Every structure is written in structure tokens, then in C-alpha cells.
Structure 1
Amino acid sequence: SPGIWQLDCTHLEGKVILVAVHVASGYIEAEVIPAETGQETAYFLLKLAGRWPVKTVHTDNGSNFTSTTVKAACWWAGIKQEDGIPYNPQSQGVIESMNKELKKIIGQVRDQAEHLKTAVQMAVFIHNHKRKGYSAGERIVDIIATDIQ
């Protein structure tokens, strides 16, 4: 499970925020895109997998699961593409809660940034640094280090 990530797409201000959540730690990366297309999702996953050891991705929907561009990116980067069906129903509620939390943080910083993309990265920062007693950034690094060793 050190290699398992979940895709999550949420909306704000008429734009799309694409999130990848590292399931075991809660650590995230995110970007604003105009629209969630296979092309956008493929490029985002390429970025993600060059930065962390992404073994499995639970895709956020069936259009991205089906996407030949998304499949090509996953093949390229050595990612196993899986569906994101919450056979465990606590998974959907946990995502919903992170979307609400992220949008809350975005509102708290929104004033400090001219552009939504900036506020979203501020939100990624605050989320990954938040101590809950460790932070998500601390958990992911410890999970993967344990796994390497």
C-alpha cells in the first residue's frame, strides 16, 4: 500500500481541481485544470509518478478509466490503473471530507492570491503540513522509506 493513490476531481469557481491522494498517508498533490479530460488526467499522472513511486492508481471515474490517453500514460509510467469503486464505502466519505476541507482552506487563503491555481497550491501546502501526532508529508515519507528498506 505505499504505492497506492486515489484520483479525486472536485469543482470550484467554474473550474476543476484534480487531486491525487496517497491513500495510506492522506498526502496530496493537486492542480487546477479547465476541464477533466483524458489528456489532462494523463499529464497529471505522468507528473505525479515522476515525483513519487506510484504503483497503483484508483481512477476517479469510468471516463478516465477508459481513456486511451490515460492508459498510455499509465503504461508509460508503470502504473497499474484500477477502478475507484468504494467496495469499502468509508472511502467515498473520506474523499468528500477532504474535498470540503480543501475548499475550506482555499476560502481562508483565497484573498491572498489573484488566481485560483495559487490558492489551490496554498491549500496543498497547508494540507500536507497540518499536524494531526504527525503530518501527511511526514507519513508518506516514513511509509515509503520503510518500504524501500
Structure 2
Amino acid sequence: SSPGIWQLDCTHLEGKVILVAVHVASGYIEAEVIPAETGQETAYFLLKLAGRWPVKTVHTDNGSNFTSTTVKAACWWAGIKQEDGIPYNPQSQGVIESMNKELKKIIGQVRDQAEHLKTAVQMAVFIHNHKRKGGYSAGERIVDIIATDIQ
């Protein structure tokens, strides 16, 4: 449960890009729809995440965001250690692929309800983070993990 570590994950749907940050120890996520994954979009997403949770380390999702000066500048600004996201544990690739599939399935389940993709993605964030698996939810786990770490 290393309380400060997050992983970036970028997935595609409807010609659009969904950027996800996963808190690795809990499975809790935040996500956004963007028109394309650029360093600027990723840097802004990181700044938002790190203002909201104590982001110590981020495993970036690809080499272009690992390289990006703009991403490195947001990581410097927000006190984040930027790392690569090489699956030294190969069970990592499989966990992220399954989350993406789960997220896309929830997006499909909420399509009668959202006119824009960005709404369906935030409904999927909500359902993902509140899902009991404990059975604790990922929202409960990340709070428990970080609070234990503060104490």
C-alpha cells in the first residue's frame, strides 16, 4: 500500500482520449476526457491530481510524457517524482488493461444517461471508486491508506 504512488494510464474511446490516474495501492482513480494526449494536457491533469491527493510518485504512461518538458515542469512544481511505468511486475499490464475494460463497460452502461462522453467518464469514476469488492471500496481504501500514513 505505498500511500503516495500513482500510475498514469491513457485509453481511447469514441475517437477521444481518456486520461486516468490510478492510486496503485487502492485502485482509486481520477480521470478526464481530453482531445489528445499532449504534454500540456498531462501536466495540467497532474497538477490537479497533486492539489487533491498527496502524490509522491507518478509512473508515467509512456515515454513521450516521461520525456515531455512540460510534464517534468508540472512534476517539479507539484513536488512529484516522475518515474517510468515499465511493468517490472508484468502483472501491472494486466491490471491496467482490466481497469480500462471495466471503465469502458461502465461507460457503456451509462450511455442512455449522458449526452457527452466527459459525463459518462465521471459517472464511471464514481461507480469505480464506490464499488465494494472488506468489502471496502477503492475510495475507502485510499483514505485508510493515506490516514494510516499520516498517523
TM-score by length of 2: 0.98
CA displacement 1:3-34 (0-9 Å, x = unmatched)? 00000000000000000000000000000000
Structure 1 distance, partners of 2:46, 2:52, is 10
Structure 1 gaps of 5+ residues are none
Query: How far off is 1:110 after superposition?
Result: 1.3
Query: How far off is 1:144 after superposition?
Result: 0.1
Q: Which residue of 1 aligns with 2:139?
A: 137
Structure 2 distance, partners of 1:98, 1:86, is 15
Q: SS of the counterpart of 1:110?
A: coil
Hey, which bits of structure 1, 4+ residues long, moved more than 3 A?
none
Structure 2 distance, partners of 1:18, 1:144, is 23
TM-score by length of 1: 1.00
Q: Which residue of 2 aligns with 1:122?
A: 123
Structure 2 distance, partners of 1:14, 1:120, is 14
Query: How far off is 1:111 after superposition?
Result: 1.3
CA displacement 1:76-123 (0-9 Å, x = unmatched)? 000000000000000000000000000000000011010000000000
Superposed CA RMSD: 0.3
Structure 1 distance, partners of 2:118, 2:48, is 16
Aligned length, in residue pairs: 149
Structure 2 gaps of 5+ residues are none
Q: Sequence identity of aligned pairs in percent?
A: 100
